[PDB]
Write a protein that holds these residues in place. Sequence first.
Motif, PDB file in Angstrom:
ATOM      1  N   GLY A  87     -20.471 -11.466  -4.124  1.00 26.15           N
ATOM      2  CA  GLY A  87     -19.719 -11.983  -5.253  1.00 26.15           C
ATOM      3  C   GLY A  87     -18.666 -11.029  -5.825  1.00 26.15           C
ATOM      4  O   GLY A  87     -17.930 -11.459  -6.710  1.00 26.15           O
ATOM      5  N   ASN A  88     -18.612  -9.753  -5.401  1.00 26.26           N
ATOM      6  CA  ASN A  88     -17.731  -8.768  -6.022  1.00 26.26           C
ATOM      7  C   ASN A  88     -16.495  -8.574  -5.158  1.00 26.26           C
ATOM      8  O   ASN A  88     -16.616  -8.594  -3.935  1.00 26.26           O
ATOM      9  CB  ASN A  88     -18.440  -7.438  -6.206  1.00 26.26           C
ATOM     10  CG  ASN A  88     -19.547  -7.490  -7.224  1.00 26.26           C
ATOM     11  OD1 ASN A  88     -19.496  -8.311  -8.146  1.00 26.26           O
ATOM     12  ND2 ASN A  88     -20.540  -6.613  -7.122  1.00 26.26           N
ATOM     13  N   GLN A  89     -15.338  -8.330  -5.773  1.00 32.00           N
ATOM     14  CA  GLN A  89     -14.097  -8.315  -5.005  1.00 32.00           C
ATOM     15  C   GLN A  89     -13.816  -6.920  -4.450  1.00 32.00           C
ATOM     16  O   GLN A  89     -13.209  -6.841  -3.388  1.00 32.00           O
ATOM     17  CB  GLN A  89     -12.854  -8.894  -5.681  1.00 32.00           C
ATOM     18  CG  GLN A  89     -12.432  -8.266  -7.002  1.00 32.00           C
ATOM     19  CD  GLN A  89     -11.143  -8.858  -7.539  1.00 32.00           C
ATOM     20  OE1 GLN A  89     -10.298  -9.366  -6.788  1.00 32.00           O
ATOM     21  NE2 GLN A  89     -10.945  -8.772  -8.850  1.00 32.00           N
ATOM     22  N   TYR A  90     -14.227  -5.858  -5.162  1.00 31.67           N
ATOM     23  CA  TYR A  90     -13.932  -4.493  -4.758  1.00 31.67           C
ATOM     24  C   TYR A  90     -15.179  -3.848  -4.181  1.00 31.67           C
ATOM     25  O   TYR A  90     -16.258  -4.042  -4.726  1.00 31.67           O
ATOM     26  CB  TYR A  90     -13.424  -3.643  -5.921  1.00 31.67           C
ATOM     27  CG  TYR A  90     -12.246  -4.263  -6.661  1.00 31.67           C
ATOM     28  CD1 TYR A  90     -11.005  -4.412  -6.053  1.00 31.67           C
ATOM     29  CD2 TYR A  90     -12.376  -4.689  -7.975  1.00 31.67           C
ATOM     30  CE1 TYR A  90      -9.943  -4.994  -6.723  1.00 31.67           C
ATOM     31  CE2 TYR A  90     -11.317  -5.260  -8.658  1.00 31.67           C
ATOM     32  CZ  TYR A  90     -10.098  -5.417  -8.027  1.00 31.67           C
ATOM     33  OH  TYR A  90      -9.033  -5.974  -8.659  1.00 31.67           O
ATOM     34  N   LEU A  91     -15.008  -3.083  -3.095  1.00 36.74           N
ATOM     35  CA  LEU A  91     -16.135  -2.541  -2.362  1.00 36.74           C
ATOM     36  C   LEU A  91     -15.906  -1.066  -2.072  1.00 36.74           C
ATOM     37  O   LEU A  91     -14.780  -0.700  -1.744  1.00 36.74           O
ATOM     38  CB  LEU A  91     -16.314  -3.329  -1.066  1.00 36.74           C
ATOM     39  CG  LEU A  91     -17.562  -3.026  -0.211  1.00 36.74           C
ATOM     40  CD1 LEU A  91     -18.878  -3.541  -0.828  1.00 36.74           C
ATOM     41  CD2 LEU A  91     -17.377  -3.571   1.209  1.00 36.74           C
ATOM     42  N   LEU A  92     -16.984  -0.257  -2.140  1.00 38.37           N
ATOM     43  CA  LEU A  92     -16.998   1.132  -1.712  1.00 38.37           C
ATOM     44  C   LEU A  92     -18.212   1.391  -0.829  1.00 38.37           C
ATOM     45  O   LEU A  92     -19.326   1.029  -1.177  1.00 38.37           O
ATOM     46  CB  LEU A  92     -17.011   2.068  -2.922  1.00 38.37           C
ATOM     47  CG  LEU A  92     -17.170   3.581  -2.673  1.00 38.37           C
ATOM     48  CD1 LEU A  92     -15.986   4.190  -1.904  1.00 38.37           C
ATOM     49  CD2 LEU A  92     -17.438   4.343  -3.974  1.00 38.37           C
ATOM     50  N   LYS A  93     -17.994   2.101   0.273  1.00 35.38           N
ATOM     51  CA  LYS A  93     -19.057   2.527   1.157  1.00 35.38           C
ATOM     52  C   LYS A  93     -19.055   4.042   1.274  1.00 35.38           C
ATOM     53  O   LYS A  93     -18.003   4.647   1.436  1.00 35.38           O
ATOM     54  CB  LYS A  93     -18.875   1.934   2.551  1.00 35.38           C
ATOM     55  CG  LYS A  93     -19.046   0.424   2.655  1.00 35.38           C
ATOM     56  CD  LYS A  93     -20.453  -0.159   2.589  1.00 35.38           C
ATOM     57  CE  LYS A  93     -21.461   0.257   3.634  1.00 35.38           C
ATOM     58  NZ  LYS A  93     -22.524  -0.748   3.809  1.00 35.38           N
TER      59      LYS A  93
END
Length: 149
Positions: A87-93
């Motif tokens: 559901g979230n638009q911004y992602l960090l790995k």
Amino acid sequence: SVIRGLAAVLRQSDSDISAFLVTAPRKYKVYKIPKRTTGFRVIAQPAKGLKDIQRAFVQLYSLPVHDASMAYMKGKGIRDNAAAHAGNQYLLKADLEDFFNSITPAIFWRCIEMSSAQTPQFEPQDKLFIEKILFWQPIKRRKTKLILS
DNA sequence: GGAAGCGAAAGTGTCGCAACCCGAGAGAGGAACGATCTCGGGTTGCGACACTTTCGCAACCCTTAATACGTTC
């Protein structure tokens, strides 16, 4: 005490468990698995006897695990992990280096000591056996380097 | 972690060159010797580079693995 618990579970004598554990950190088979592109990963698998002991240990002693931990959890996996972020638009790995091989007996015991949740308490006499159950000795000559595999 | 062979990086020593100094010698002008210029051997400072040392890539997978098909670490 750890020995008595294991012996009961595995239906073996305290003496034969103790004897087996003396060189348990060296009872690993080392082999290579192909990577998907080029090259190999190096894997160390415990011998059968040791695997049984390790499984028994894990059964006997429940260690706390956070809900955010998705790997190796009963009734969870990669689908649940991915769904948590869908559901979230911004992602960090981010990734940890040499994760398993970075975990030493020292780290383990520190974590036991620090733990905010309830941990099993071990007798000092059992600590040496626990290290022999859980940690691999990659270098035959160097008895002092024990790491998770 | 780190075989065996290899070369990068960095420090040290060698050595050939060029510049310079010095004494020797043939002998310009015309009798009084020795003006000027060059030979030949030695010393010194310099800097390019040959030699030396250290580090670090990553073979191997330890006696000790399992084998229904996939996915992830």
